[PDB]
């Protein structure tokens, strides 16, 4: 019995829930593991924007020297039929302008709302009090009626691997 998996890299945030890595990220730490169990992820190989972060494989923490924290990682999976196995990123426009991805899990749940050509999803039921409007592609938070902008890309997809019987 074999049957493959999406691997997704998660760190810790102060609010105690995982965010997920990007897929080029993902990829890199991936070929760390394979050669070395107890080796050192040096994210500033990949891009200049990553130069502060080092994933240390050995105590399976996230170091960053610009800030100074240590978080926890996770190599968490995911079923090869969801938006990560194929490359499809839901993101939303944070105030300083940048695109930041939503929980892995959301994510999902995301795409598999906008496939089933639903308008809307509301994401109370899962813990975020907003709703998701793909006419106008914005976010909506429930309370305040404030919106934010979010798109969809196809970016890479995660590694996928084998978890044998
Ligand atoms: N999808 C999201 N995931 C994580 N954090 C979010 C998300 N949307 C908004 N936030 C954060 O919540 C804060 C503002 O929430 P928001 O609902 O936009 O404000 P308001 O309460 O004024 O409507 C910001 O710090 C923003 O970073």
Redesign the pocket.
């Given at each position: 019995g074999n049957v493959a998996r999406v691997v997704v890299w998660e760190w810790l945030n102060e609010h105690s829930r995982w965010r997920p890595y990007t897929a080029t990220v993902c990829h890199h730490i991936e070929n760390v593991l394979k050669e070395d169990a107890r080796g050192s992820v040096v994210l500033g190989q990949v891009d200049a924007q990553l130069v502060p972060y080092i994933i240390d494989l050995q105590s399976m923490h996230q170091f960053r020297q610009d800030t100074g924290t240590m978080r926890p990682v996770r190599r968490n999976f995911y079923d090869p039929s969801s938006a990560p196995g194929k490359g499809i990123v839901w993101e939303?426009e944070?105030?300083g302008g940048a695109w930041?991805a939503?929980?892995m899990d959301?994510c999902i749940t995301i795409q598999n709302a906008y496939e089933k050509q639903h308008p809307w999803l509301d994401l109370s039921s899962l813990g975020?009090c907003?709703l998701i409007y793909f006419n106008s592609m914005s976010?909506m938070?429930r309370?305040?009626?404030?919106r934010?902008r979010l798109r969809r890309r196809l970016d890479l997809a995660y590694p996928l691997t084998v978890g044998s019987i």
């Open positions: 939303w944070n105030d930041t939503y929980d959301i975020f907003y976010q938070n309370q305040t009626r404030r934010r």
